[PDB]
Amino acid sequence: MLTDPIADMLTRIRNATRVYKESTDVPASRFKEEILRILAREGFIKGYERVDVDGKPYLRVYLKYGPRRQGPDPRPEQVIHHIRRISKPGRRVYVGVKEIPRVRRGLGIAILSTSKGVLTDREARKLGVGGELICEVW
């Protein structure tokens, strides 16, 4: 049914990285890409190619992971430690340029859709705008 596509993707990613894999797909969307467009440019991931799955257009998303640690649990650190949806379809979150977040005192990023396209916690403050606060990642 998918009452929330965006969230589905975020979770689609969250569930892959947790088990460590090279790439997981996700249904194509103009709005969906502009979101991944942020993660690439912010290095949160590698990239993605508008691949195709049985006539249906998906988006093979490529994940980065830290260096193979040693000792008990050699599994590497996460490039994307945490990601959760903010403005959900059951509750939209709208903030002005003065009410913008502050993920991990700068150490993180926040993605929001505004009247000037898909921006960042920063760009929003730089541009001087504000809109629906999508999520947070670090």
Q: Which of 79, 106, 116, 137 binds RNA (CB under 7 A)?
A: 116
Of residues 23, 29, 60, 65, which one binds RNA by CB under 7 A? 29
How many whole angstroms from its chain centre is CA 45?
9
State the sign of the Cα–Cα–Cα–Cα dihedral 57, 117, 1, 62: positive
The one among 5, 23, 65, 103 contacting RNA by CB under 7 A: 5
CA distances 77 to 30, 67, 83, 97, 138, Å, are 31, 7, 15, 33, 12
Piece in contact with RNA (CB under 7 A), picked from 38-46, 62-70, 103-111, 115-123: 115-123
| CA–CA dist 72, 70 (Å, integer) | 7
Interface residues with RNA (CB under 7 A) are 1-5, 7-8, 10-12, 14-16, 18-19, 21, 24, 27-32, 34, 55-57, 84-85, 88-92, 94-98, 113-118, 128-132
